[PDB]
């Protein structure tokens, strides 16, 4: 059920926020200025 984690200081586009996930295919890491949702999840 737990697929990954979200890291950052403000968790928006102002700063660069760490994003780690593990989908059904492979582990992907991106370091971007994601504009994260208030309630992010996977379905």
């Amino acid at each position: 059920i737990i697929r990954g984690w979200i890291f950052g200081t403000t968790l928006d586009s102002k700063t660069q926020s760490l994003l780690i996930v593990n989908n059904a295919t492979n582990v992907v890491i991106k370091v971007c200025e994601f504009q994260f949702c208030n309630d992010p999840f996977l379905d």
């Binding site: 102002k14 700063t15 660069q16 200025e33």
Partner: protein, 48 residues
Amino acid sequence: SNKLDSKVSGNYNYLYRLFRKSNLKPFERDISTEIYQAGNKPCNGVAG
């Protein structure tokens, strides 16, 4: 870089910051575009 970076009217391609909130931790970067609190009264979006 005078040969490669020199404009007669002033090379504005490079930007430098003066009024930061505080001394930054080594090996960290800030991309904030907000107006710095340069006094006592809160800025609240007001510059000058």
